[PDB]
Design a protein around this motif. Structure first.
Motif, PDB file in Angstrom:
ATOM      1  N   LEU A   1       0.828  -1.200   0.000  1.00 34.97           N
ATOM      2  CA  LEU A   1       0.000   0.000   0.000  1.00 34.97           C
ATOM      3  C   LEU A   1       0.867   1.255   0.000  1.00 34.97           C
ATOM      4  CD1 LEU A   1      -2.811   0.646  -0.340  1.00 34.97           C
ATOM      5  CD2 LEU A   1      -2.761  -1.631   0.698  1.00 34.97           C
ATOM      6  N   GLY A   2       1.961   1.213   0.745  1.00 37.49           N
ATOM      7  CA  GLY A   2       2.899   2.319   0.732  1.00 37.49           C
ATOM      8  C   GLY A   2       3.267   2.807   2.118  1.00 37.49           C
ATOM      9  N   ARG A   3       3.162   1.932   3.108  1.00 39.12           N
ATOM     10  CA  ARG A   3       3.534   2.287   4.470  1.00 39.12           C
ATOM     11  C   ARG A   3       4.883   1.676   4.814  1.00 39.12           C
ATOM     12  NH1 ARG A   3      -2.264  -0.569   5.471  1.00 39.12           N
ATOM     13  NH2 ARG A   3      -1.307  -1.985   3.940  1.00 39.12           N
ATOM     14  N   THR A   4       5.897   2.527   4.872  1.00 40.22           N
ATOM     15  CA  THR A   4       7.247   2.105   5.203  1.00 40.22           C
ATOM     16  C   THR A   4       7.341   1.705   6.671  1.00 40.22           C
ATOM     17  OG1 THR A   4       7.724   4.165   3.975  1.00 40.22           O
ATOM     18  CG2 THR A   4       9.558   2.650   4.370  1.00 40.22           C
TER      19      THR A   4
END
Length: 36
Positions: free
Chosen positions: A16-19
């Protein structure tokens, strides 16, 4: 933010794009950082 987060913690972004931070020792994949 002077010293880095504990050794073994790896900066890993998810699909999703959560580091998040994947601890290599226990593999605790949290996205809130092992710190304040």
């Amino acid at each position: 933010g002077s010293p880095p987060l504990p050794p073994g913690w790896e900066e890993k972004v998810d699909n999703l794009g959560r580091t998040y931070y994947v601890n290599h020792n226990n593999r605790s994949t949290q996205w809130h950082r092992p710190s304040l």
